[PDB]
Amino acid sequence: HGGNIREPATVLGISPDQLLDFSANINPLGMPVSVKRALIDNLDCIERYPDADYFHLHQALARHHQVPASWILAGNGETESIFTVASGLKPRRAMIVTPGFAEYGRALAQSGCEIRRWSLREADGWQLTDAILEALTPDLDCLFLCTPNNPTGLLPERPLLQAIADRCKSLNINLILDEAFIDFIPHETGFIPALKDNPHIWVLRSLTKFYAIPGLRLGYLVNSDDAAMARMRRQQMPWSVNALAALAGEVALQDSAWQQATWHWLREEGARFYQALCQLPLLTVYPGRANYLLLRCEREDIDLQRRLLTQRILIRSCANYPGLDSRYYRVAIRSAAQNERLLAALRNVLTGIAP
Amino acid sequence: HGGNIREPATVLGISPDQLLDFSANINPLGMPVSVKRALIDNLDCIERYPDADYFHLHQALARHHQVPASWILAGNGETESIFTVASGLKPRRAMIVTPGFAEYGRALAQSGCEIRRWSLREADGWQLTDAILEALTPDLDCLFLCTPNNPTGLLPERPLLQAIADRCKSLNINLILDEAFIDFIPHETGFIPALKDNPHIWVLRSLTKFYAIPGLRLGYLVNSDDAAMARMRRQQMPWSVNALAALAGEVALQDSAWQQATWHWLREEGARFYQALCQLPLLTVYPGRANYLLLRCEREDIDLQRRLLTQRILIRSCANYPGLDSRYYRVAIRSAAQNERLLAALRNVLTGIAP
Ligand SMILES: *Cc1c(COP(=O)(O)O)cnc(C)c1O
Ligand SMILES: *Cc1c(COP(=O)(O)O)cnc(C)c1O
Secondary structure, eight states: OOOOOHHHHHHHTSOGGGOEEOSSOOOTTOSOHHHHHHHHHTGGGGGSOOOTTOHHHHHHHHHHHTSOGGGEEEESHHHHHHHHHHHHHOOSEEEEEESOOTHHHHHHHHTTOEEEEEEOOGGGTTOOOTHHHHHOOTTOOEEEEESSOTTTOOOOOHHHHHHHHHHHHHTTOEEEEEOTTGGGSTTOOOSGGGOTTOTTEEEEEESTTTTTOTTTOOEEEEOOOHHHHHHHHHHSOTTOSOHHHHHHHHHHTTOSSHHHHHHHHIIIIIHHHHHHHHHSTTEEEOOOSSSEEEEEESOTTOOHHHHHHHTTEEOEEOTTSTTOOTTEEEEEOOOHHHHHHHHHHHHHHHTTOOO | OOOOOHHHHHHHTSOGGGOEEOSSOOOTTOSOHHHHHHHHHTGGGGGSOOOTTOHHHHHHHHHHHTSOGGGEEEESHHHHHHHHHHHHHOOSEEEEEESOOTHHHHHHHHTTOEEEEEEOOGGGTTOOOTHHHHHOOTTOOEEEEESSOTTTOOOOOHHHHHHHHHHHHHTTOEEEEEOTTGGGSTTOOOSGGGOTTOTTEEEEEESTTTTTOTTTOOEEEEOOOHHHHHHHHHHSOTTOSOHHHHHHHHHHTTOSSHHHHHHHHIIIIIHHHHHHHHHSTTEEEOOOSSSEEEEEESOTTOOHHHHHHHTTEEOEEOTTSTTOOTTEEEEEOOOHHHHHHHHHHHHHHHTTOOO
16 A cells, blocks of 8 residues: 555665655645644543543534434544445455446455455546446445545545445445545535435445544444444454544544645645646646546556655555556645646656657 | 543533542553653644554564564453454464453454353362363463462462473474563563463453553564564554654663562552451451452342442443352452551451341
């Protein structure tokens, strides 16, 4: 996975402090100031076990989405929520969509599930199409989708998601939607608002990217099925959410200006960054909707990750993602100054080269 | 599990802040001052993912035990290490000893293991005897022991552990030793020093009780089998140890006076506390070796946990531990002032009553 600055620094024989990381997609605003204050002023809570039931955290999450607290189960990162859903639903047959986030295949493999892959097509610009509907069959127990997709950044239109959601309902298939980056996309509500009466739908959320607290580990799962969620609480390990994460979560949801400030940055700097990248030669830039962009280098003989590492800039290589190949890379969208150094580095590598 | 002050407070209709908790066994010294300083001064590390490989943390743990770093895998609390060992060894048949720590049975059940229970006997003062040796058979894949035992506090003599360890070696049985509280016991090294050449032995450790950081969640597993430990690293969820826990761990191991100060407190206040309890009527006190004591109320009609809750003091009831019954309770050993309030409360409940 990206963000492994320590391993990148190790390969170069330097300290991770000298790397400009564009392989992790963390909100460049940093952790909310209020979250930092709360952590410093409540550090002493570390001396006691967290609330095994996470009452305050879950109340805050439920207030935030205006749903019953019984529908929510926080996790030690959304990563834990992915393993919890896999172990709790224990599918016999499940479908994933590739290119996509690798942890689903890992969690499903560990739970002993037959995995079917629906392949996105380069000829479709990696866009999810309605062709997937016919591929859904009664023997499938679960379908997992990433909305928006990692690494492409594409967000399937609500009508298509709704049609898949309805076909899953009729074929008794659980639909798991990974909304890790949904809060970066202006005015996108995701599916939490539609879970009442759609107990086959599961939504995964993360505070990692959006609130810039990847090191604390906090995510959550939301679903309206009483029995299934009761099962999820038993399947999850006790005390798995640390006390500081739970405190951070509660405080972060209280920042009323945070989202607007992110949308504004993404609309301004994010758009300028995307435009600048599209101006580079030998580079296809896919229209990502959140804080990262999938790139395809048109010269297969150019190792963009290696070239940028010489400049101490780390990008994500998508060479090993099923469905992609070595021409594919992913870069975060960060601050203007940081984005400028990445552009300068790419620009020097890509300009002056024949097709 | 104990330490659920929120749930206890909920049952009474009060705030957990008004309860004196003797149901969690946390070092009363609190978190090391150096750990608190380090956390405050490095809070910003939360903005990046932890090192997926935990190089610094594992180097510190390896330096501490003077063993190869390859033998260690930190966990999100020793609780995670218990689930990791269960899922990584995937035993078909395993033996546990009861009364004991409940998470082993839960982790084994989830991994689909046939569980055999070796029962400790009240007639033996709950002491582990050599009779267990004959109960070990070739069809067993694993044997799990708690050293010292939770909730009894008893530490099996090294010779008996060595004999069990050798019988497991000959019968190809993995021996897992839970040393969560071993550092509280003066001059007890545990088994880490003997793992070289004993790859069938696994040791679980926790920084939770000893360094008073239960809210941060940090424990670890140690074993000298190359392949098996490689498997454990794959079985464990990515980024499961949060960044602050990893930092705390490294700093805590640097406190050279911490252990002596704990042994001193335990030898002084701990002994005075144990003696005072033995003076109470209608109360059997087992000779615990760490920071907790198992109590047996001689009047079955006296609900000690309920009576103490009226005084806003929470103790652990061992009524639901397989092998024990409602006469059994467990109390932490804390500060002198705190211990005095517990004694006063017990003394008022127990004095003035006929046999
Ligand atoms: C980053 C990411 C995750 C995991 O997030 P954490 O909360 O840090 O574990 C899950 N899914 C997708 C699609 C992600 O990008
Ligand atoms: C407390 C305890 C654990 C778990 O400790 P954490 O590090 O907080 O998960 C495991 N085993 C025993 C015997 C314990 O007492």
